[PDB]
Design a protein around this ligand. Structure first.
Ligand code: ZN
Length: 108
């Protein structure tokens, strides 16, 4: 479908849709400055994703989104690294999980 964002390598496999896109605030209370940590502009954040295999267990090491652990996520079909699943370290956070997907790894 027109909303469909698929793995660029295998083409057929849908990873997320444009419907699931949202904007995560990279700042904390009062919207203070933060040093950029990783490369967020290149990363698309979505609430829900599909057809990915999670590799290993959640890690907090040098997380691009502080407060969240990350787990590598690769296409079930072709094993291309599309991005990461992010899971909250604290119960009071929202969303408790989301996906950060490398834009260049998707089509469109
Ligand atoms: Zn693929």
């Amino acid at each position: 479908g027109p909303t469909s964002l698929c793995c660029k390598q295998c083409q057929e496999t849908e990873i997320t849709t444009k419907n699931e896109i949202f904007s995560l605030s990279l700042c904390g209370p009062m919207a203070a400055y933060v040093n950029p940590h990783g490369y967020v502009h290149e990363t698309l954040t979505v609430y829900k994703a599909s057809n990915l295999n999670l590799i290993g267990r959640p890690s907090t090491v040098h997380s691009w989104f502080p407060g969240y652990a990350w787990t590598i996520a690769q296409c079930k079909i072709c094993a291309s690294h599309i991005g990461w699943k992010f899971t909250a370290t604290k119960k009071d956070m929202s969303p408790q999980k989301f996906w950060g997907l490398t834009r260049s790894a998707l089509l469109p």
